[PDB]
DNA sequence: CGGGTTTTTGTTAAGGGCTGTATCACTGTG
DNA sequence: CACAGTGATGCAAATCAAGTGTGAAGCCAGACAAAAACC
DNA sequence: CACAGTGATACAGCCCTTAACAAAAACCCG
DNA sequence: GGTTTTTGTCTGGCTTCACACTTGATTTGCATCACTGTG
């Protein structure tokens, strides 16, 4: 520090005289600007910005909200975050990140059961407490040895608490929507919220060791997402919000999770009864909640679409999927669906199913089994979940692709000329089709077909590669035209807005459907004479009506719940306690934090 | 910026003309010293320490080695790390984390094929190049239509290059081990290194779609671990570095990864024979490496213990 | 080696490019990086 | 009200170097 | 006796906020005065 | 039309050097 | 021995940081708990 003055003595004197006669007298500032000049000439902008930060207010320290957002959205675990915090702190000195306990204290604001709320008509059969979080999903079910045995573990939120937590999470999005819609900001009208409920059972989950019931290796998830929010102004309602990615993993919010078999109806009902109870209780009430200094009220309209075909059949009091009555929207037999294939109308509903079950149980006309089933149109159980008649886009695509795959297998051998075939011939057909598919379109043979397989197999190159193995040309042109018709029909029930981006396709859906039906019934009598798939029946009869009724198909699909299922295993393996009596609670909380949208605007703040 | 350049157009001229006289023309360092002395005259000591640290990359900056260490040992992917870096920079204003290209540049120091090494005697049938990296595990196997069909994907390192990188990754560890035993530091005695060889196949690995042969849904991994390093001192043999947790995932360094089936014998031999040839060549030679400013020579002894019974029987003889 | 097998399985989907041609090299590279004492010792900054 | 003076801020082009983003065939829950 | 997680909980320990009057240190002045590595 | 990754590579963008010129804002005083 | 560099000091006077006490009041660190996962 001392032995370096003899080299700057000659120069600092002119430094001060120049600063005095030109700048005014400051020396530190005139040297700072000079050193910034040198640095940014040398192209060391990183160190230049570091010096600017040191001289100005220090930027050290992140907010707990942004720390939690990083730790959650980078798929990080608590231990890894702790050691990253430790190493960063110990190396750089100043504490940049924040302690795990600070993150924990900062995360209760978004979990349900922290915000005050009330209902103008008090909700029936549910408490008015406002500090309820993760409660047991069994709802105090009798676990005594004298009762019906229980073998499930379930952790759940109250549905109203989940809704209010999500609403206060989306508070600022709702306010931004009010601003962008050219309305006011302090308006407190009756908000109408539309939510989607999705339920799908999972398999291949591995039960853990330890004390507990004889829990099965099948899991069932219940989740909800918010699609549309509308407020009334004058004589119309404005769209203050609309979900950008309705099928993403970031919009579905977990609500009730359990480790129970899908078809195990007794425990399914035992766990899902409370949620349906709250649903029916709050379907005719009004929620008053404080939003940024102004109280605002909320209505609720519920649409259930995220159920697959087996779930709908099971929970709507219907028979199995292989029954004569195929469609869960209309009362038509499989055969009659094969002769007509075009004209239908949706006539099934939850109340109609309930009264049909009442008729079935009471037998008020003194009829036999067959006559009573013909009277009830296939209802043999009491439904307990209310869903709207809708089509699941993902599974519709999967089923259609499977049927086309079978069509190709039977066409690469010309079964229309060989009505009788052995098992060996069909196995050879399978082998050659798989080999050529790999060779040409680079698809591996798989036993359970995915949606990527469906999207790739639903191309023109597919029928080209399949057809060059077909000796005849009539089959070539038939498959070509049928595939083109299917590809023209597809974009209607797969787009989030079929009324805007596909107007011509939506208008010509009916003509394409009729062409598809007549082509099947004429050229494919060897596959669709007396039997046709319920998914073809749906795609040819019910899609335009559902489009007109709802507005879109595919935004209400089960893709979001499938992505949540994907996340469930990852969280169970990485971000949850490995114990049988806490894992589901930890998974539920972490999934709620991940799907929370307050942690999501922090990760795209770079675009601001 | 332009106004500052306009106002200070000449002071730069005098300082640059005097830098050529007093020092030689390094304006950045002399101006840094001038700012430090200005702060000292203004009496700011902790701030002066902060500037000294940021120049030395201690108070902030997070030199790319540390960022890469976090990204790898924290199980963060490249995309997630990029999101973290972008959001941290956007919020804090400073550049706490290093960019992806900086991490990639700092990566090459650790990967095989960066350090110069010389063999004495030269290895039999092994090239003397010191820039070999990820080479195909098929070892130039024929893949034409007229010969045996190959349906495997394999990537592997050269054994000598992999061992050079492994030895240099623990350069400071070897120095510390030699210091802790009250030996010298620049000692260049022949190191007797024992390496455990481990190979085990797997099952239930899904095949991807995409270009490539009909590669089966099984994988076989070949990896090596470094147990003990000893140097010859005096009359006896002294130990330097012993692996504290030999059965851990932090010391099973991969050597050759092929996505084939261990039940098959032809493909196994075809992919694994060159590695055995390199091992046999290295079994009777010595390696010279510039180890921390002093050249030191290595000798290697190998033990293939990490095999299960079925693979042992299918490799070295007896029927399955 | 069993722990290495676990690391291989999770790196195959976590931090490796999804392509039959150029995935194995990425797995090998990342595993070599993860098994590096030079990187690992920066995670032990308590002394 | 407007020249006149002083200062700010940008512009022109050939190069160097750091940072940011699009593109490629694929995954995965189904 | 594999070993690195997996997160919530809880208690020991570190840091601090309040008050003013001290000590201790760094540095400014411009100038004079000894060690030390190449000829 | 599922949508958020997965990592390597290449190209675009932006900011420094030279030095003289040009569009523009703030007081002064006839 | 010359020459240049490298440190040393001088006293009055200025700013700048640490501390002297004490009583709570937080905030940070690290072990416990029964478990997974690759075989
Ligand atoms: Ca399912
Ligand atoms: Ca094995
Ligand atoms: Zn129908």
- Write the DSSP assignment of B45-101 as a string of letters: HHHHHHHHHHHHTSSS---HHHHHHHHHHTT--HHHHHHHHHHHHHHHSS--SPPHH
Three-class DSSP category at B201: strand
CA dihedral C18→C20→C22→C28, nearest 10 degrees, is 80
Alpha-carbon distance of A590 to A572, in angstroms, equals 10
3-state helix, strand, coil in chain C (%, to 5): 65, 0, 35
Nearest CA among A74, A78, A95, A229 for reference residue A599: A74
What is the rounded CA–CA span in Å between residue A289 and residue A171?
A: 11
* φ, ψ dihedrals at B299, nearest 5°: -125, 145
Answer yes or no: are the C-beta atoms of A160 and A282 closer than 8 Å. yes
Interface test with C, best of A75, A80, A82, A87 (most C CBs within 10 A): A87
The Å distance, Cα B136 to ligand 2 centre, comes to 24
B170 interface with C at CB cutoff 8 Å: yes
Closest CA to A570 of A72, A134, A103, A64: A72
Ligand minimally distant from the alpha carbon of residue A204: 1
Beta-bridged to residue B136, according to DSSP, are B155
> Dihedral of CA A513/A515/A518/A524: which sign?
negative
Query: Is residue A134 within 8 Å of residue A157, measured between CB atoms?
Result: yes
H, E, C per residue of A494-553: CCCCCCCCCHHHHHHHHHHHHHHHHHHHHHCCCCCCCCCCHHHHHHHHCHHHHHHHHCCC
Q: Which residues have CB under 8 Å from A308's CB, separation 6+?
A: A200, A392, A395, A558
Nearest Cα to A434, choosing from A467, A466, A475, A404? A466
Q: What would you measure as the largest C-alpha separation in chain C, in angstroms? A: 44
What is d(CA B172, CA A451) in angstroms, rounded to the nearest whole number?
52
3-class DSSP state of A241: strand
CB B73 within 8 A of CB C34: yes
CA atoms within 13 A on the CB side of A268: 19
Q: Binding site residues of A, as ranges? A: 200, 308, 562
Q: What is the DSSP string of B236-255?
A: SEEEEEE-S-TTSTTS-EEE
* Alpha carbon distance A249, A198 (integer Å): 12
**Do B221 and C4 contact (CB within 8 A), yes or no?**
yes
Evaluate the omega torsion of the peptide bond into residue A170 and state whether it is cis, within 30 degrees of 0: no
**Best CA proximity match to A349, nearest among A389, A378, A314:** A389
Name, in order, each residue with C-beta under 8 angstroms of A595's C-beta and a sequence gap of 6 or more.
A249, A250, A251, A252, A253, A254
Beta bridge partners of B156: B135, B256
A573 Cβ partners below 8 Å, 6+ apart?
Answer: none
Residue with tokens 């700092």: B106
Confirm if B94 and B60 have CB atoms less than 8 A apart. yes
Nearest to A375 by CA among A361, A362, A356: A356
Distances (CA, A) of A382 to A44, A332, A356, A361, B203: 73, 20, 9, 9, 46
Q: State both tokens at A442.
A: 């680079």
CA angle A295, A300, A301 (to 5 degrees): 155
Instruction: Provide, in whole angstroms, the distance separating residue B10's CA from nucleotide D7's C1'.
Output: 16
Is the distance from CB of B74 to CB of A97 less than 8 angstroms?
A: no
Residue in chain A closest to B216 (alpha carbons) equals A444
Residues B198 and A207: their CA atoms lie apart, in Å, by 31
Residues B196/B224, Cβ–Cβ less than 8 Å: yes
**Interatomic CA distance for residues A222 and A472, integer angstroms:** 50
Beta bridge partners, A200, equal A221
Q: Any idea how long chain C is?
A: 47
Rounded Cα distance between B297 and B302, Å, is 17
User: Which of B92, B173, B174 shows the shortest CA–CA distance to A61?
Assistant: B92
Note whether A514 and A352 are within 8 A (CB).
no
State the CB neighbour count (10 A cutoff) for residue A17.
10
The secondary element (H helix, E strand) that includes residue C24 is helix C24-34
Distance CA B225, CA B255 (A): 10
Which is nearest to A570 in space by CA: B80, B102, C13?
C13
Phi-psi region of A383 (alpha: psi -120 to 50; beta: other; left: phi over 0): beta
Q: Which residues contact A304 (CB under 8 A, 6 or more apart)?
A: A196, A197, A385, A386, A387, A388, A390
Phi, psi (5° rounding) for residue B255? -125, -40
Contact status, residue B296 vs residue B188, Cβ threshold 8 Å: yes
Among the listed residues B225, B236, B128, the one whose alpha carbon sits nearest the alpha carbon of residue B189: B236
**Residue A451 DSSP SS3:** helix
Instruction: Compute φ and ψ for B303, nearest 5 degrees.
Output: -135, 120
Q: Which two tokens stand for residue B208?
A: 């991807």
Phi, psi values for residue A288, rounded to 5°:
-105, 125
A116 contacts: CB under 8 Å, gap ≥ 6 = A130, A290
Contact A8 B37 (CB under 8 A): yes
- Whether B132 has its CB under 8 Å from any CB of chain C: the answer is no
The C-alpha atoms of residue B91 and residue A65 are separated, in whole angstroms, by 12
The token pair that represents B14 in the structure block: 């005098």
User: What gap in Å lies between CA A510 and CA A344, rounded to an integer?
Assistant: 12
**Residue B106, phi-psi category: left (phi > 0), alpha (psi -120 to 50), beta (remainder):** alpha
DSSP string across B160-183: HHHHHHHHHHTHHHHHHHHHHTT-
Q: Which DSSP state fits A607?
A: G
Query: Of the candidates B195, B203, B196, which has an alpha carbon nearest to the alpha carbon of residue B221?
Result: B203
Under 8 Å between Cβ of B80 and A75: yes
- Centre a 10 Å sphere on the Cβ of residue B258 and count the other Cβ atoms it contains: 26
3-state secondary structure of B123: coil
CA distances from A259 to A138, A214, A220, A307, A312 (A): 11, 10, 6, 18, 20
Query: Do A537 and A341 form a contact (C-beta atoms < 8 A)?
Result: yes
Q: Which two tokens stand for residue A533?
A: 């798939």
- The rounded distance, in Å, linking the Cα atoms of A596 and A168 is 10
Residues 6+ apart with CB under 8 A from B60: A50, A92, A94, B53, B54, B94, B96
Residue A310: other Cβ atoms inside 10 A: 15
Two tokens, residue C17 = 């490019």
CA distances (Å), origin A352, targets A269, A327, A383, B210, C8 = 20, 15, 10, 50, 55
Cα A17 from chain centroid (whole Å) = 70
Q: Which residues of A437-471 are buried (b: 16+ CB within 10 A; e: fewer)?
A: beeebebbeeeeeeeebbebbbeeebbebbbebbe
Tell whether C2 is in a known binding site: yes
* CB A544, CB A331: distance < 8 Å: no
CA distance A149 to A267: 10
Beta bridge partners, A237, equal A232
Burial of A415 (0-12, 13-18, 19+ CB in 10 A): middle
Q: Which residue is nearest to nucleotide F7 (CA to C1')?
A: C17
CA angle A571, A576, A580 (to 5 degrees): 115
Q: What whole-number distance in Å separates Cα of residue A600 and Cα of residue A598?
A: 5
The kind and range of the H/E element at A77 are: none
Nearest ligand atom owner, CA of B205: 2
Flag whether residue B75 sits within 8 Å of chain A, measured between CB atoms.
yes
Contacts of A525 (CB under 8 A, 6+ apart): A416
Q: Are B154 and C23 in contact (CB under 8 A)?
A: no
CB A41 within 8 A of CB A35: no
Identify which ligand lies nearest to the alpha carbon of B202: 2
Chain B: closest CA distance from residue C46 (Å): 14
Chain C residues with beta carbon closer than 8 angstroms to that of B215: 20
Q: What 3-state class would DSSP assign to A440? A: helix
Token pair recorded at residue B12? 């730069």
Contacts of B12 in chain A (CB under 8 A): 34, 37
- List subunits contacting chain A, requiring 3 or more Cβ pairs under 8 Å: B, C
Give the 3-state DSSP-derived string for B3-59, with helices as H, strands as E and coil as C: HHHHHCCCHHHHHHHHHHHHCCCCHHHHHHHHHHHHHHHHCCHHHHHHHHHHHHCCC
Hey, how many other C-beta atoms are within 10 angstroms of the C-beta on A417? 8
Give A123-126's long-range contacts (Cβ < 8 A, gap of 24+): A123/A160, A123/A278, A123/A281, A123/A282, A123/A285, A124/A281, A125/A277, A125/A281, A126/A158, A126/A160, A126/A277, A126/A278, A126/A281
Residue A258 alpha carbon to ligand 2 centre in Å: 33
Residues 8-47 of C with CB under 8 A from B: 8-9, 12, 14-15, 18-21, 23-25, 27-43
Give A257's contacts (C-beta < 8 A, 6+ positions apart): A137, A154, A155, A156, A219, A220, A221, A222, A568, A584, A587, A588
- Give the Cβ contact number of residue A305 at 10 Å: 23
- Torsion sign (Cα): A178, A183, A189, A190: negative
Q: Report yes or no: A116 and A128 within 8 Å, Cβ to Cβ.
A: no
Residues across chain B: 320
**A91 contact residues in C (CB cutoff 8 A):** 42, 45
Q: Do strands A287-291 and A154-156 pair parallel, antiparallel, or not at all (unpaired)? A: unpaired
User: How far apart, in whole angstroms, are the C-alpha atoms of residue B306 and residue A567?
Assistant: 35
The DSSP 8-state label assigned to residue A301 in this structure reads E
A227 in Cβ contact with A301 (< 8 Å): no
Question: Which chain C residue is nearest to residue B221, measuring alpha carbons?
Answer: C5
Q: Indicate yes or no: CB of A59 within 8 angstroms of CB of B92.
A: yes
Cβ contact C28–B200 (<8 Å) = no
- How far away, in angstroms, is A342 Cα from ligand 3 center? 10
How would you classify residue A292: left for phi > 0, otherwise alpha for psi between -120 and 50, otherwise beta?
A: left
Buried b (16+ CB within 10 A) or exposed e, A95-121: ebbbeeeebeebbeebbbbebebebee
DSSP summary character for residue A228? E
Q: What residues does A226 pair with on adjacent strands?
A: A195
CA distances from B166 to B107, B116, B169 (A): 14, 14, 5
Nucleotides of strand F under 7 angstroms from a protein beta carbon: 1-10, 15-18
Report the helix count and the strand count for chain C, using DSSP H and E.
3, 0
Among B190, B191, B200, B184, CA closest to B170: B191
In the block, residue with structure tokens 């006011």: A184
End-to-end CA distance of chain B: 78
Instruction: Give Dmax (Cα) for chain B.
Output: 89
Distance CA A242, CA A239 (A): 7
Catalogue the E-assigned strands of A148-211: 154-156, 190-202
Centre a 10 Å sphere on the Cβ of residue A69 and count the other Cβ atoms it contains. 24
Distance B95 CA to D14 C1' (A): 31
Pair of tokens at residue B177: 């081990």
> CA B62 to CA B103: how far, in whole Å?
11
Helix (H) / strand (E) element for A438: namely helix A423-441
What is the distance between the alpha carbons of residues A495 and A551, in angstroms, rounded to a whole number? Answer: 11
Instruction: Report DSSP state, residue A137.
Output: T
Note the CA–C1' distance, B133 to E38, in angstroms: 49
Distance from C-alpha of B96 to C-alpha of B106, rounded to nearest angstrom: 16
Chain breaks in chain B (C to N over 2.5 A) after: none
Q: In this structure, are residues A237 and A189 in contact, taking their beta carbons and an 8 Å threshold?
A: no
* A6 CA vs E31 C1’ separation (Å): 13
């Amino acid at each position: 520090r001392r032995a370096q003055k003899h080299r700057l003595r000659e120069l600092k004197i002119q430094v001060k005289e120049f600063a005095d006669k030109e700048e005014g007298g400051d020396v530190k500032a005139v040297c700072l600007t000079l050193f910034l000049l040198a640095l940014r000439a040398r192209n060391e902008h990183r160190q230049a910005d570091e010096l600017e930060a040191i001289m100005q207010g220090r930027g050290s320290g992140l907010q707990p909200a942004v720390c939690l957002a990083i730790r959650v959205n980078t798929f990080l675990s608590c231990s890894q975050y702790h050691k990253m915090y430790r190493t960063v702190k110990a190396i750089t000195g100043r504490q940049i990140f924040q302690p795990l306990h600070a993150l924990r204290n900062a995360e209760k604001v978004l979990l349900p059961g922290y915000h005050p709320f009330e209902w103008q008509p008090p909700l029936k059969n549910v408490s008015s407490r406002t500090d309820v979080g993760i409660i047991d999903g069994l709802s105090g079910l009798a676990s005594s040895v004298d009762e019906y045995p229980v073998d499930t573990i379930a952790k759940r939120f109250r549905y109203d608490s989940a809704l209010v937590s999500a609403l206060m999470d989306m508070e600022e999005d709702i306010l931004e929507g009010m601003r962008s819609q050219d309305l006011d900001d302090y308006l407190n009208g009756p908000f109408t919220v539309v939510v989607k409920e999705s339920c799908d059972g999972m398999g291949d989950v591995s039960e853990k060791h330890g004390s507990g019931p004889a829990v099965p290796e099948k899991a069932v998830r219940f989740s909800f997402t918010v699609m549309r929010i509308t407020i009334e102004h004058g004589s119309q309602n404005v769209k203050v919000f609309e979900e950008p990615k309705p099928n993403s993993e970031l919009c579905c919010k977990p609500l009730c999770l359990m480790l129970a078999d899908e078809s195990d109806h007794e425990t399914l009902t035992a766990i899902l009864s409370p949620l349906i109870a709250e649903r029916e209780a709050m379907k005719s009430s009004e929620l008053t909640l404080e939003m940024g200094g102004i109280p605002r009220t909320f209505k609720f309209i519920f649409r259930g679409t995220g159920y697959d075909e087996k779930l709908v059949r099971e929970v709507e009091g219907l028979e199995a999927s292989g029954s004569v009555y195929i469609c869960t929207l209309c009362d038509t037999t499989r055969l009659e669906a094969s002769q007509n294939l075009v004209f239908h109308s949706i006539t099934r509903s939850h109340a109609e199913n309930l009264q049909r079950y009442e008729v079935w149980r009471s037998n008020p006309y003194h009829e036999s089994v067959e006559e009573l089933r013909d009277r009830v149109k296939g209802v043999s159980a009491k439904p307990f979940i209310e869903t709207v008649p809708s089509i699941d886009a993902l599974h519709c695509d999967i089923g259609n692709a499977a049927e086309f795959y079978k069509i190709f297998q039977l066409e690469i051998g010309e079964v229309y000329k060989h009505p009788n075939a052995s098992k060996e011939e069909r196995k050879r057909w399978q082998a050659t089709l798989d080999k050529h598919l790999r060779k040409r379109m680079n698809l591996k043979p798989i036993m359970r077909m995915n949606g990527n397989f469906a999207r790739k197999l639903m191309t023109q190159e597919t029928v080209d590669a399949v057809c060059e193995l077909i000796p005849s040309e009539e089959r070539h042109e038939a498959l070509r035209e049928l595939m083109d018709l299917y590809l023209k029909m597809k974009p209607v029930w797969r787009s989030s807005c079929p009324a805007k981006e596909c107007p011509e396709s939506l208008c010509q859906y009916s003509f394409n459907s009729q062409r598809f039906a007549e082509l099947l019934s004429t050229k494919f009598k060897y596959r669709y004479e007396g039997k046709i798939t319920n998914y073809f029946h749906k795609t040819l009869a019910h899609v335009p009506e559902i489009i007109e009724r709802d507005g879109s198909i595919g935004a209400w699909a089960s893709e979001g719940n499938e992505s949540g299922n994907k996340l469930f295993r990852r969280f169970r393996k990485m971000n949850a306690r490995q114990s049988k009596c806490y894992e589901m609670e930890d998974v539920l909380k972490h999934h709620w934090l991940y799907t929370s949208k307050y942690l999501q605007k922090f990760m795209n703040a770079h675009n601001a």
